[PDB]
Amino acid sequence: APTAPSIDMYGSNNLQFSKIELAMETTSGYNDMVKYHELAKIKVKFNQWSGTSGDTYNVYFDGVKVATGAITGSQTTASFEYGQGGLYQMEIEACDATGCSKSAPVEITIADTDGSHLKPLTMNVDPNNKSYNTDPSIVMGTYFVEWGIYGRDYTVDNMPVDNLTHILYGFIPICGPNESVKSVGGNSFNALQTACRGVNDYEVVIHDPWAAYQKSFPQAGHEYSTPIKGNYAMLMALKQRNPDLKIIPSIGGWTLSDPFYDFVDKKNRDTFVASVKKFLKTWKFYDGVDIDWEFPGGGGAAADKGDPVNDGPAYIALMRELRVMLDELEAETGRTYELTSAIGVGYDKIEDVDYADAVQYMDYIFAMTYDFYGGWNNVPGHQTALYCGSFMRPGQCDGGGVDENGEPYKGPAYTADNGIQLLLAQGVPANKLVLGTAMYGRGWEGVTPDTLTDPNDPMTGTATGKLKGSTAQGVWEDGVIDYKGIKSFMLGANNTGINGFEYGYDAQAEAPWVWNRSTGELITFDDHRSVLAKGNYAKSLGLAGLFSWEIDADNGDILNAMHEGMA
Ligand SMILES: CC(=O)CCCCn1c(=O)c2c(ncn2C)n(C)c1=O
Ligand SMILES: CC(=O)CCCCn1c(=O)c2c(ncn2C)n(C)c1=O
């Protein structure tokens, strides 16, 4: 018989609560911006302007009483703590001696980072991505990059999630020496320096909090009071849609690997592994960790780093220590966590680590079978070929020959099969190796016909510099072009070449190219045919599956081909 309470939406923060507290309007150090709590604090204001208010209130979630307290006149605040994320129908009841009266139910959101409060994400996928019935044992992975939401305009709801088993989210940085990030730009370095304020060196952080959790995506229903936004709330909603999908944070990559070279000291590995455990406890939708150190022994972005004696053993120790930590998380949560790594596949990278030893701790190695040639120099070659191409000289495939200046090759040529064969020769099990496909080309200009030593093969020519182009054509950085740009502006609908380009295919290498003889523009890439060849090779050798880099650059053709090739 008191008056039933009426809920004051606005003084109750629109009924948006959360276990994780996230700064939304400011940017500072990671430990200042992100605070995970075991209990969310819930504060709901209600009023009883007519009749009598009663003495006590009870708050119910789905019919279960979760809080109680005293009615305070015509407006009352119920404050309490709650440990379980979800969406609940809340009623508030007011009671006295003459009876109790309940409010109408209202939905309350209690966010947690497994997405338990979120409906399955609504997808917006290009319908060129087709449907397949691939064996669910086969890895079909891709990388999604955090910055793809800026000029590339490629968001989580654009991914063809039903054709993926693993999404690798690139990239999570490690606080410490990171001068290589300046090659991306000063704002990107500054973002990392801001994130690491108040954070110990060797701990992980989020590089761009705006893209990870602050930015409102209207396609995901985000609003002002949504407690978790950004890419991460979308990946939480994607996991609600596809609960068997593995989403794994990738630490490192080309510009973010400089801290790994300090892991020869165990104290820094210990700091790092602890920080990864804290990161996975904070962002519960992640299913493991991918380590992308480029590269133990050196040969990455920082020319002055790399210890070929001590980096391999440090890498193996890091994989052992990560697996010990992840087994602790499995015991605490009842979940399974995976440990993986993307690795270089030149002979010079593979010789610097004993992968037979490291891989006993790992679920998968993502073999980076791409970037063998590129616009960093003027030497054309197939960047992601399976086998040795027609352009290679006598003795170059195996490495016992000499170059066109008479200088001895130092090891086997850069092809995907030379790298796979060296990993298998070490003792790495085939069923843990995942072979890489490129969803982009690399390219040059100035490869004119008079530079070719073999006039049917422009990979025997010589370039004058990097491919240039607009972002409209998929050229975000000189020398690199998205596959979907190559298909729209170089291949055309018949795949034979448009806009002055002709398509070619090295049937021995398994490698496509497009060449404009007028501008000497040449691009090396992966296409439907080379990807089918990679699938056949993975089937033949019993590999774990395929992965691609990076998903925003595909128009569906490459992922469709990965499925067709593994069928
Ligand atoms: C790793 C690779 O080959 C792709 C590089 C794309 C350029 N790039 C970044 O690497 C990057 C970045 N922001 C953070 N990171 C680590 N942006 C904006 C970027 O363009
Ligand atoms: C096959 C192998 O071991 C490759 C070694 C790295 C190739 N590579 C790059 O990827 C690269 C690069 N500059 C930018 N990037 C991304 N350079 C000079 C390079 O050699």
Q: Would you list the DSSP string of 483-520?
A: HHHHIIIIITTTTS--TTEEEEEETTTTEEEEEETTTT
**CA 407 – CA 68 distance, rounded (Å):** 83
Range of the domain at 56: 1-111
Q: How far apart are CA 366 and CA 360, in angstroms?
A: 15
Q: Looking at the DSSP assignment, which residues form a beta bridge with residue 480? A: 442, 477
How much distance in Å is there from the Cα of 254 to the middle of ligand 1? 8
- Residue type at position 2: P
Nearest-atom number in ligand 2 for the CA of 347 is 3
Ligand nearest the Cα of residue 553 is 1
**Whether the CB of 183 sits within 6 Å of ligand 2:** no
| Same-domain status, 69 and 121 | no
Resolution (A): 1.6
412 with 453, same domain: the answer is no
Kindly tell me the sign of the dihedral angle through the C-alpha atoms of 330, 333, 335, 338. Answer: negative
CA atoms within 13 A on the CB side of 215: 17
Backbone angles phi, psi at 356, to 5 degrees: -65, -35
Total of domains in the chain: 3
Distance of CA 184 from the midpoint of ligand 1 (Å): 6
CATH at residue 21: 2.60.40.10
Task: Say yes or no: 410 and 551 in one domain.
Answer: yes
Cite the DSSP H helix spans in 258-359: 266-282, 311-333, 347-350, 355-358
Pocket residues: Cβ below 6 A from ligand 1: 147, 171, 184, 188, 207, 253-256
320/314 Cα distance (integer angstroms): 10
Q: Where are the alpha helices (DSSP H) in 181-248?
A: 186-195, 209, 230-241
Q: Which residues contact 205 (CB under 8 A, 6 or more apart)?
A: 29, 30, 172, 173, 175, 192, 195, 196, 199
User: What was the structure determination method?
Assistant: X-ray
Q: Which of 567, 555, 550 is nearest to 144 (CA)?
A: 550
Contacts of 2 (CB under 8 A, 6+ apart): 48, 51, 52, 53, 54, 71, 94, 95, 96, 98, 99, 100, 101
450 and 434 fall within a common domain: no
d(CA 172, CA 293): 12
What distance in Å separates the CA atoms of residue 413 and residue 28, rounded to the nearest whole number? 46
Question: Final residue of a domain: which of 111, 136, 154?
Answer: 111
Residues 81 and 229 in one domain: no
The residue from 55, 87, 111 where one domain ends is: 111
497 and 541 housed in the same domain? no
* Per-residue tokens: 276: 């990864």
Query: Do residue 338 and residue 485 come from a single domain?
Result: no
Alpha-carbon distance values, 441 to 56, 152, 332, 474 (Å) = 68, 16, 44, 10
Question: Quick one: tokens of 511?
Answer: 């490698």
Helices of type H across 445-492: 483-486
Whether residues 266 and 401 fall in one domain:
yes
CA angle 275, 276, 281 (to 5 degrees): 95
Residue 366 shares a structural domain with residue 323: yes
Same domain, 324 and 455: no
